[PDB]
Amino acid sequence: EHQAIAKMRTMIEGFDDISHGGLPIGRSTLVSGTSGTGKTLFSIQFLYNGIIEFDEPGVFVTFEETPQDIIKNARSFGWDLAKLVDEGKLFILDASPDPEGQEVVGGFDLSALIERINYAIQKYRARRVSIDSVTSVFQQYDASSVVRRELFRLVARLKQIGATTVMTTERIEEYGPIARYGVEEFVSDNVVILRNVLEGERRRRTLEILKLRGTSHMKGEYPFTITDHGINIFPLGAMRLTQRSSNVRVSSGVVRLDEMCGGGFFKDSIILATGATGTGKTLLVSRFVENACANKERAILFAYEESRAQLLRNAYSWGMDFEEMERQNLLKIVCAYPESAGLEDHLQIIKSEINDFKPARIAIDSLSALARGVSNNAFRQFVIGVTGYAKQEEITGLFTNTSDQFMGAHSITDSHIEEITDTIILLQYVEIRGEMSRAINVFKMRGSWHDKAIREFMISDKGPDIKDSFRNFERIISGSPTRITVDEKSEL
Amino acid sequence: EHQAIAKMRTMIEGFDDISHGGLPIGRSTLVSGTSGTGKTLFSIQFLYNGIIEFDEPGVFVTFEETPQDIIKNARSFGWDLAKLVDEGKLFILDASPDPEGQEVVGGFDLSALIERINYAIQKYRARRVSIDSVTSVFQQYDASSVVRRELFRLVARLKQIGATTVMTTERIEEYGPIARYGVEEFVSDNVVILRNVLEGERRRRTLEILKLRGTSHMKGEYPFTITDHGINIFPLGAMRLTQRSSNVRVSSGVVRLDEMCGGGFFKDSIILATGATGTGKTLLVSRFVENACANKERAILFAYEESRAQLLRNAYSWGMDFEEMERQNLLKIVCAYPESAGLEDHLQIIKSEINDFKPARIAIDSLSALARGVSNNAFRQFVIGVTGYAKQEEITGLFTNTSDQFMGAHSITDSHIEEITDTIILLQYVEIRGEMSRAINVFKMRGSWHDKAIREFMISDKGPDIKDSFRNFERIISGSPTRIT
């Protein structure tokens, strides 16, 4: 063909993006990674989506796992391969060793296997093939060279057959060589590397497309998660900067604030409330979530610091009843510890919820909490995730950030996310006569006018009351002001 | 001969400057890298260019990839090789192994292949030769010493024949030995290393001319990109300090601002707009991007923080009308997340757009965003790149930076780009009576006078209104002045 290689869609969520269409038709993609990375799973999701979505027959060749075990473990994702096998759509060809015994199984092996495969393909009219762990085959007594040739033979005979194949391989080091023999990376046309990176005591899964001879692909590692739906990849670096923006306004749940914001937050906008511990971020959230129920809209509240019990105790105490918001089915509370998983897991958790509850407002009490430990880049990436997800989804996001130091805060955010956010509400402590009073400033607002006032405010059972600025002070921001004016009133 | 080693141009963008001229004639250059680095694409771009620019025949010896595949793959970049083959300008010598099977045909191995490569050179009057993955050949069962002889012999037969060769090898360690057997390094005259260095979930491609017997060449790694047009290297260090410089002015889209700058910006200049989050850089960017259209001059606005939609929104609330700008074909919006690529790539995309649109003004909203995560050195290199480019293309550039701390920032740029810039507009907050007012200062202008006052300003639908300075205050730069009555 006078054309540049074409790709078969895998349908594995996110992979097709990273691969600019899927896998090159007629060629073999090697998928390698250490133990428990998702090799096998990937190979099955590949054949499975083929059958279900394009009615393209597949042949799964297995060297170590038993056809029963393969079907069985597939139920973990709601896949009945047993049924597909029956309908002649899927054909697992068992090439594993019988628990008994026979020697010299390396000669005929490949050859007899190739026509076994050939016959299978020809037979069920298959378009997709998966060979799970070729590695275990020469794992009989071979050296690099014997591996290089044997491989080249199977890739080649397979290519001639016209099958779009996925071959699996095991590794021993997360970043060491690509595949056991350091010979496979070259013999294959395409190379994909699945990583199960430790780092901390957490494990981050990532997928990289090392090379796709003939075409272009995204470069690098992409975090992904195995779920009850298989491999789910998040091309955070593929998400486009083309989200929608309306001048539609919506309320903060605190009128005076709405005023300060030029008349309520924009519907399309990511909000951030910062400030030292205890200033009142959670309050503005509660009042923010509520406001979405009072108007009969749906809102979720992912809290990483407090519980569902405490969030309800303190919320009632500020006048709004979360209980009802629940029953009526307009408010949904999540709750979980930042350590209960890794950033890639949370982002998905979040994305999930959002799909089943279709919120109109979303609040994440404390990003500063999800930044506990994680790397700064890994974090920033996460923020783009949630942020960028809700933004294109016309969801108003309110995020919290506790400043690492009360009073004297020289930077809005310690993780520098400032640029990623549309609106920024600042809460700070002001020392005024041996007493600690709050201040509330609408630091910025992208589309609106807002008010440049550092208004003090109080919290009570009614909630937050926004009073007036400290016009007669110098160094408010510092948290430790000073009074001015030296002329009271005298005669002429 | 009696003179300076002659060099054959590769025409591979940027490589000839790196190698000062091209690849040494009649000698063979070793090119190694790990899988997916572009070894093949290099050796094919070598022959392919020889044929298309110089009508120099080429012979492509393949040891693993199939001839039809090598052809097919090249379509990636829009290169019909089947044709070049059919016209006799290129010949793909298929030396790979039989898919079927045999083991006693290659007993005259090395020698026979030399007579085949040799017969082909004389046949097609080949000048350039690419041997792809010689490595896999001895990948049958050999020891280092055995590889140093066969390699030597070959290289020699081609040097005798007089062909200028490109032999490609494969590595396993991005920074370990140059080739599998740590023997090819020294059997070749030239060594070029291709690297796909990971480093933080992102890959960066670099090229390095490790050695070139007999001549000089640029030392160290240069970053490259494999695009639709093949390899493409930016010799960022090879860019000289030879940009033209006029005294002609241009407006900032804000009269008063042009007044503070002694009559606006200099056409040939890099302007920096620093300020804490919210101060108003984008408001300035927009007004700058608009002034180019009113003058019927093209301008590109590379956004990395907001969107085409939002920008358009916010632009509208400040007056103007980005919509019209677009239609009229006077303004172009880009948009992309820093993460949506590595610095090397972004640089390109930018370069790219500029070429297809020939803008008079460029605005990169938030350099500070581009600097996210990357290394400071790799970032400086990026600024020197974009900057230097516009500076040589007579393009006026407005770059934006957001300081990490609002108020009291003690340096214009955290990444330290100040020196690389001609003019620096600075925006800061100032606490006046429990309120947050703005201030704008033309911190520096290399060829003009410019006002030295720290004037306050408001943002209204109409736009930015530069007013008067805080004369009766002390420590305004501290963010929290001290009104002295």
Ligand SMILES: Nc1ncnc2c1ncn2[C@@H]1O[C@H](COP(=O)(O)OP(=O)(O)OP(=O)(O)O)[C@@H](O)[C@H]1O
């Ligand atoms: N329903 C599920 N939800 C979440 N994770 C799961 C689920 N099922 C399996 N997993 C995870 O995926 C893993 C299975 O790995 P998998 O069988 O895909 O291939 P592998 O380890 O790459 O290769 P191989 O097991 O053949 O050596 C489990 O170990 C577990 O970590």
Ligand SMILES: Nc1ncnc2c1ncn2[C@@H]1O[C@H](COP(=O)(O)OP(=O)(O)OP(=O)(O)O)[C@@H](O)[C@H]1O
């Ligand atoms: N009924 C109430 N009356 C007066 N003040 C209250 C009442 N409830 C809470 N507060 C005040 O509000 C503060 C609680 O903080 P809040 O729930 O707003 O979250 P935060 O400051 O954002 O984050 P964190 O509490 O984790 O520091 C307390 O410090 C307290 O002074």
Ligand SMILES: Nc1ncnc2c1ncn2[C@@H]1O[C@H](COP(=O)(O)OP(=O)(O)OP(=O)(O)O)[C@@H](O)[C@H]1O
């Ligand atoms: N049109 C294209 N646009 C962008 N990138 C491309 C395009 N075509 C190929 N690529 C990229 O270039 C690479 C090609 O590498 P190439 O086949 O030239 O040799 P190699 O990777 O050095 O060695 P090997 O033969 O072992 O793969 C691909 O892996 C891919 O990342």
Ligand SMILES: Nc1ncnc2c1ncn2[C@@H]1O[C@H](COP(=O)(O)OP(=O)(O)OP(=O)(O)O)[C@@H](O)[C@H]1O
């Ligand atoms: N319609 C408007 N009317 C009055 N003021 C506005 C209006 N729109 C925006 N503003 C003001 O302008 C500021 C917006 O900043 P701008 O869009 O210019 O970029 P920035 O501050 O430089 O950077 P970033 O917003 O990415 O942090 C807000 O802080 C706000 O005070």
Ligand SMILES: [Mg+2]
């Ligand atoms: Mg707290």
Ligand SMILES: [Mg+2]
């Ligand atoms: Mg709290």
Ligand SMILES: [Mg+2]
């Ligand atoms: Mg390679």
Ligand SMILES: [Mg+2]
């Ligand atoms: Mg190659």
Ligand SMILES: [Mg+2]
């Ligand atoms: Mg900013």
Ligand SMILES: [Mg+2]
């Ligand atoms: Mg901005």
